[PDB]
């Protein structure tokens, strides 16, 4: 649903309510301003028409009416300023309150609620929803009330002057209002139509953009493009249809307006000739009622914007309804004083609310005394991390009761409990500040002496000594600037500065070497005597010196006691220890050069539109002229009929002209967007992996540029030409005709024209909005908001809500003041222009009264000059408001030209190279070194070497991140190494054909990803440029043992799978990845983590096809499960990129090295 109206203005103080009341009154005055001017104008032409009697007191009467005009103008100046300022101020203050409350409401939130909610929604929902609320409660409400008052005032003034004419204009007033509203809503910045049309197509893009490396692995660069192109043509067609309808309705509005002119003048002349009404009376009635009925149309976009704001505010109020079930700041919590090391767990059952169907825990009972180093051992999946999280009050347990030193947690304070438990998690995150602040985040008042003692306790001072800015170094995002060991050591320091009572480590020495882990554990025993400690780790070196060792099994703690007790117990831990022992140019036109005819037709119609405002004026003036001259009735009647008929024909010409101009420019614009998007997508696919490595272009640049390139280039060429041509025609010819009829008055008015044009632009731009280009202003605040999400894992040790909230509010302080100032400024400008219109009326007609008094020019001629120039200036401003900006378009087009030129010598579209007819299948690496282009300082390789022969099952064992997938990427022509020599059967890959190597082989990915089609097309993707037989499909499905799961599904080989296979399970998509790779029949086969998520009966049926098909083809398997490693032919072990051991499996098992400690992990 949507919020209530009253809850929208809930955060508004009484001061802001006063602002709203006065702003409403100001808008009502400002709205009643215009029809009164038209009333004065009617009376003024009535005087001018009698001035020449068979000129006396002309200048006097025109002085009187100039005073009237000036007074109305000044009143409107005051009302406009008040109305704008007060509403912008009220909206700004309220939005500041809402941002603060929102950011604070998300802080408490709920444990695991963040995992449920989307990360992108939490960062995006915020800015989008809040900016959408601001627009709805901002000046739009003020303009709505202004329009209402204008409508009522116009109708009242009309009804008072003459009722007969206003009855007819009322009879036609519904259609006028509907037309104005439909015209405006289409014209109300309809960029949402493109995002709606491209919404389907865009999706496909991101799928590709999600996994470019996989799309590189299989031959789908060409196959996806066609799938992208076919999606694109539909949005192209829908857009072309949308442009036809918009222009039809706009032209129909124009026809209706001019038809109302014709009807009003026909009936009004019938009234004037009969003596019922005078001429000025008719002009007053007509223009007042027309303006009112036309402001009813202006009222509508604001109604839509208000509804949209309500819709987006509903969610935010829901967010503040959320309750974490833990009060971080209710000072009603209970705080102990004689805190002593003690842990009590009894009958503890708990499950994750994300997946509540599965029960990990089935009760665990523990009692841990003070100073008792308790280690827990067990394979991954039992919930070591779960107990950790279930220890610092993150979640509450569903069964039992947990206590700490007598009393239970469920009645004491959470924050006081949270500060006293120093915990390091598995993978820590580090705030992107200086390292003095990072290590300061433990507690408030820490001097640099305690800092140094802490870091020296952490033994993380050497790498502090070597780097510059020893306390001022700004660590990069997510610990990317420093190494992992330095990172985990300072994380230990960051925990120790709290001086805790209970210490909880969780995989504290994952990537750490021998001596630093040794000195870390000695420091941990240096500060364990006063505290209770629980340590979780995989290395048994830091475990053997503990107090108590225990073991998880199925969530229940089974084995208890000391080291020797589990030695004589001969359980799983006795099995473990038994086994262990820039440039800017203009080329835009050329991009659209091909579509030369459309523009031509367009240009022509644009000329005619320019000629619609001067021509109007001429006709307009002459009709009034007919009642100024002294003629018999019949002459007045037939001239008036002629000119009214001219109005009708002018409306029809405008209808056809608008239709043609809009149609042709829209057709050319959509064809341009299609061609351009196709070219850019193609070039993105053609680009090298290095181009994808740069983090600017990783997700958002490539996705954004594809939607930003279409919308802009059309504004760069077509809109620019249409608007410049139409304005030049209009203003030029109007000024020329005015020059010829009177030269003094034209110069006088030219002095004032620019103000009227920029006035129209300001008006329309007020309707459109400010676009919120304040990422620079809101930049630090958004950084803080994102880093709170990032460090949400670090929030667990110390919530630090107040610290982040203070940083964020301090960030917001500057935009708030700036925004109040900006609101004042915008009010001043809008008011000045809105008044300058009426001032211009006054001055022009007083100067013209002087002129008529001395017979320098006729009244019809001054009226023609004024009408032409003024109305031309208004139309000029209006037209220049619809055009998009040339600057944005130009910078986009430059980026695009840069994208297309980029060529990383991929050599995928070229045949040239070495093409032998034959091969053997022998690979020889030598002295091969590789450095990532995005990390040029950090080497991950130090010159490995390898020898692979036919059918040689070569295992590659190492730590996580020791150049495992790198050799895959070295083979697959992703990166070409700076140094080294690779001989593929005595044929260097650098001289071969590039696609031939990518054709012969075929691998499985580290993560399985599929495409947005069925599973037949998933497996069919493996083989390209080839007629894919379905017998191979079902044969591969059987060989991968996925046949059963496909034949079990309804619409078996047509079952539509979503993105990345998010419908079916992980093992099944891994198997279908096996099947997809299987149809390649590679002479060289690579497996990377072939059993990451798979059952033990499925691993065998996977490996049987491998074993029967490993013959004849070279096979290279990389995995952590030793099952495929025992049967391998040869085995290579890596350490920081260096080959340490190689040869047969029995040789490495004979000489006990690091591979003996590797294989002997869980066996026995």
């Amino acid at each position: 649903p949507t919020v209530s109206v009253f809850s929208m203005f809930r955060y508004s103080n009484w001061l802001d309510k006063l602002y709203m009341v006065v702003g409403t009154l100001a808008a009502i005055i400002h709205g009643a301003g215009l029809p009164l001017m038209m009333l004065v104008f009617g009376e003024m032409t009535d005087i001018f028409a009698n001035a020449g009697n068979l000129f006396m007191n002309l200048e006097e009467d025109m002085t009187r009416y100039a005073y009237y005009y000036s007074g109305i103008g000044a009143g409107v100046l005051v009302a406009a300023y008040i109305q704008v300022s007060f509403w912008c101020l009220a909206a700004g203050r309220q939005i500041h309150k809402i941002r603060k409350q929102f950011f604070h409401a998300i802080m408490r939130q709920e444990i695991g609620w963040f995992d449920v909610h989307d990360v992108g929604e939490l960062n995006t929902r915020l800015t989008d929803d809040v900016s959408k609320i601001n627009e709805g409660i901002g000046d739009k409400i003020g303009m709505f009330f202004q329009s209402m008052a204008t409508f009522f005032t116009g109708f009242i003034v009309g009804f008072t002057r003459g009722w007969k004419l206003t009855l007819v204009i009322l009879a036609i007033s519904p259609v006028l209002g509907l037309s104005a509203a439909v015209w405006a809503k289409i014209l109300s910045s309809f960029t949402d139509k493109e995002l709606l049309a491209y919404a389907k197509a865009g999706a496909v893009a991101e799928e590709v953009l999600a996994a470019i490396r996989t799309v590189i692995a299989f031959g789908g660069q060409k196959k996806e493009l066609e799938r992208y192109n076919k999606n694109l043509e539909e949005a192209k067609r829908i857009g072309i249809k949308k442009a036809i309808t918009a222009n039809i309705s706009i032209g129909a509005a124009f026809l209706l307006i001019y038809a109302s002119y014709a009807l009003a003048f026909w009936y009004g002349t019938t009234l004037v000739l009969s003596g019922e009404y005078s001429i000025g009376q008719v002009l007053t009635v007509f223009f007042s009622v027309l303006i009112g009925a036309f402001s009813v149309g202006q009222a509508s976009p604001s109604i839509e914007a208000f509804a949209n704001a309500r819709g987006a505010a509903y969610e935010i109020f829901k967010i503040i309804d959320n309750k974490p079930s833990i009060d971080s700041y209710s000072k009603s919590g209970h705080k102990p004083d004689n805190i002593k090391g003690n842990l009590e767990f009894r009958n503890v059952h708990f499950s994750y609310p994300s997946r509540k169907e599965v029960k990990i825990l089935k009760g665990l009972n523990l009692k841990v005394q003070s100073g008792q180093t308790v280690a827990l051992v067990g394979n991954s999946g039992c919930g070591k991390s779960t107990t950790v999280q279930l220890m610092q009050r993150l979640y509450d347990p569903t069964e039992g009761m947990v206590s700490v030193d007598g009393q239970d947690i469920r009645t004491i304070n959470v924050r006081f409990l949270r500060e006293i438990i120093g915990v390091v998690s598995q993978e820590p995150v580090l705030f992107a500040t200086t390292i003095a602040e990072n290590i300061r985040y433990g507690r408030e008042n820490v001097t640099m002496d305690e800092i140094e003692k802490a870091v020296k306790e952490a033994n993380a001072y050497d790498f502090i000594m070597k780097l510059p800015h020893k306390f001022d170094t700004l660590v990069g995002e997510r610990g990317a600037q420093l190494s992992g060991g330095q990172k985990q050591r300072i994380a230990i320091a960051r925990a120790l500065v709290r001086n805790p009572k209970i210490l909880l480590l969780d995989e504290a020495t994952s990537a750490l070497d021998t001596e630093s882990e040794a000195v870390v554990q000695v420091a941990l025993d240096k500060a364990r005597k006063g505290r209770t400690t629980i340590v979780i780790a995989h290395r048994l070196s830091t475990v053997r010196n503990a107090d108590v060792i225990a073991g998880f099994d199925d969530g229940v703690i089974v084995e208890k006691g000391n080291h020797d007790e589990l030695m004589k117990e001969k359980g799983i831990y006795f099995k473990l220890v038994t086994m262990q022992t820039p440039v800017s140019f203009w080329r835009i036109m050329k991009l659209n050069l091909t579509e030369w005819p459309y523009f031509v037709v367009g240009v022509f119609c644009a000329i005619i539109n320019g000629g619609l405002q001067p021509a109007f004026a001429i006709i307009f003036s002459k009709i009034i002229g007919v009642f100024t001259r002294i003629d018999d009735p019949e002459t007045k009647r037939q001239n008036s009929n002629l000119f009214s008929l001219l109005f009708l024909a002018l409306g029809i010409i405008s209808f056809i002209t608008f239709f043609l101009q809009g149609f042709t420019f829209g057709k050319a614009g959509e064809i341009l967007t299609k061609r351009l998007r196709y070219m850019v997508f193609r070039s993105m696919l053609r680009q090298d992996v290095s181009w994808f490595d740069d983090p600017k272009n990783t997700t958002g640049a490539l996705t954004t540029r594809l939607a930003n390139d279409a919308a802009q280039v059309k504004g760069a060429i077509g809109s620019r030409l249409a608007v410049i041509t139409q304005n030049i025609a209009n203003l030029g010819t109007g000024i020329i005709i005015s020059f010829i009829y009177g030269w003094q008055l034209t110069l006088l008015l030219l002095a004032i024209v620019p103000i009227i044009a920029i006035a129209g632009v300001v008006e329309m731009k007020m309707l459109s909005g400010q676009a919120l280009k304040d990422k620079k202003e809101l930049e630090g605040a958004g950084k803080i908001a994102t880093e709170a999400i990032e460090n949400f894992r670090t929030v667990v040790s110390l919530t630090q809500e107040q610290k982040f909230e203070h940083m964020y509010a301090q960030s917001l302080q500057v935009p708030y003041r700036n925004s109040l100032r900006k609101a004042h400024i915008f009010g001043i400008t809008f008011s000045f222009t809105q008044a300058m219109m009426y001032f211009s009326y006054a001055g022009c007609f007083r100067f013209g009264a002087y002129l008529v008094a001395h017979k320098l020019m006729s009244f019809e001629d001054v009226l023609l000059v004024f009408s032409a120039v003024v109305f031309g200036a208004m139309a000029v401003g209006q037209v220049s408001s619809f055009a998009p900006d040339y600057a944005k378009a130009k910078i986009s087009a430059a980026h695009i030209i840069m994208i297309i030129e980029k060529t990383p010598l991929i050599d995928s579209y070229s045949t040239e190279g070495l093409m032998p007819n034959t091969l053997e299948g022998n690979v020889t690496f030598g002295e091969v070194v590789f450095n990532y282009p995005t990390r040029p300082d950090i080497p991950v390789l130090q010159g490995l070497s390898l020898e692979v022969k036919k059918g040689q099952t070569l295992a590659l064992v190492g730590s996580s991140g020791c150049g495992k997938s790198t050799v895959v990427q070295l083979l697959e022509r992703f990166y070409d190494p700076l140094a080294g020599k690779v001989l593929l059967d005595g044929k260097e890959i650098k001289r071969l054909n590039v696609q031939w190597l990518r054709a012969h082989l075929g691998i499985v990915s580290q993560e399985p990803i599929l495409f947005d089609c069925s599973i037949a097309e998933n497996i069919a993707y493996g083989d390209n440029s080839r007629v894919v037989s379905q017998e191979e499909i079902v044969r591969a499905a059987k060989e991968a043992n996925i046949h059963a799961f496909i034949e079990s599904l309804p619409n078996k080989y047509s079952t539509k799978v979503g993105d990345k296979g998010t419908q079916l399970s992980g093992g099944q998509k891994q198997r279908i990845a096996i099947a997809r790779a299987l149809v390649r029949q590679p002479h060289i086969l690579l497996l990377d983590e072939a059993t990451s998520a798979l059952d033990t009966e499925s691993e065998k049926v996977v490996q049987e096809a491998l074993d029967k098909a490993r013959e004849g083809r070279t096979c290279i398997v990389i995995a952590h499960r030793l099952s495929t490693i025992q049967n391998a032919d040869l085995i290579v072990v890596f350490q920081n990129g260096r080959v340490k051991e190689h040869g047969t499996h029995q040789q490495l098992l004979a000489q006990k090295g690091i591979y003996f400690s590797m294989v002997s992990v869980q066996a026995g």
Partner: antibody
Framework: EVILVESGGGLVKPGGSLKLSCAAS????????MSWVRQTPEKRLEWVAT????????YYPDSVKGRFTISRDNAKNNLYLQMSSLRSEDTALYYC????????????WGQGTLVTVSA | DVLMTQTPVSLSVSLGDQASISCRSS???????????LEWYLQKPGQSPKLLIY???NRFSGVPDRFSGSGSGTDFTLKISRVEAEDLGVYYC?????????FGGGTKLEIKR
């Protein structure tokens, strides 16, 4: 005041042609409608022509239509009556007349100029 | 077309007396707008004609008040009360409502002495 002086009257043979002119001073010639009226020697007046202020519309009765023509120079302030295919029933005194507001047809009259058509 | 006939052709009024001229058309003189266009002109001997009443009841600028015009339907009469010796002359009634415009004729006035 309002001064209308017309001239161009002589003797012409039946079936010939003639051209009359009327110069006007003291008012804006281009803002008034102008008429030509004819008075026979039987003291019976008759309407002859009418031209609007712009000169766009021209009204003749169904007795001289197609033979006569009326024209006007607003820059020189002159009114011209071009005649052709004369007749014995055109011997008469011609006045140029002005048009009053409040829908009065003839406010200011000329002096009259005589036109005789015979052999 | 439309013909206008004055009821009297000649009228002899002593100085100080009053008298009325009536101008009857056959077709009713009513324009499409609604106004009725009837004017009365006077031509003194040896002078161009001068406008007397510019709509059945109105009076041109400078016209003396003793001229009084009243008109009903298709019968229209101008009556002068206490006519002076200067005001004698020939009177015509002009009608400009239909597309041919015609004058009446006649109405000679002779002051008795």
């Amino acid at each position: 005041e309002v001064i209308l002086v017309e001239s161009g009257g002589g003797l012409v043979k039946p079936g010939g042609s003639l051209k009359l002119s009327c110069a006007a001073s003291g008012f804006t010639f281009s803002s008034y409608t102008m008429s030509w009226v004819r008075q026979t020697p039987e003291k019976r007046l008759e309407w002859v022509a009418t031209i609007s202020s712009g000169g766009g519309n021209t009204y003749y009765p169904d007795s001289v239509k197609g033979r006569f023509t009326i024209s006007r120079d607003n820059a020189k302030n002159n009114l011209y009556l071009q005649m052709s295919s004369l007749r014995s029933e055109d011997t008469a005194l011609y006045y140029c007349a002005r048009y009053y507001r409040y829908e009065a047809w003839f406010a200011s009259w000329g002096q009259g100029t005589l036109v005789t058509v015979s052999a | 077309d439309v013909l206008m006939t004055q009821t009297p052709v000649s009228l002899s009024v002593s100085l100080g007396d009053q008298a009325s001229i009536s101008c009857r058309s056959s077709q009713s003189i009513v324009h499409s707008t609604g106004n009725t266009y009837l004017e009365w002109y006077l031509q003194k001997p040896g002078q161009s004609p001068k406008l007397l009443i510019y709509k059945i009841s109105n009076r041109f600028s400078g016209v003396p008040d003793r001229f009084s015009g009243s008109g009903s339907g298709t019968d229209f009469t101008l009556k002068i009360s206490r006519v002076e010796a200067e005001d004698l002359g020939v009177y015509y009634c002009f009608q400009a409502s239909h597309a041919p415009r015609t004058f009446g004729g006649g109405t000679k006035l002779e002051i008795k002495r």
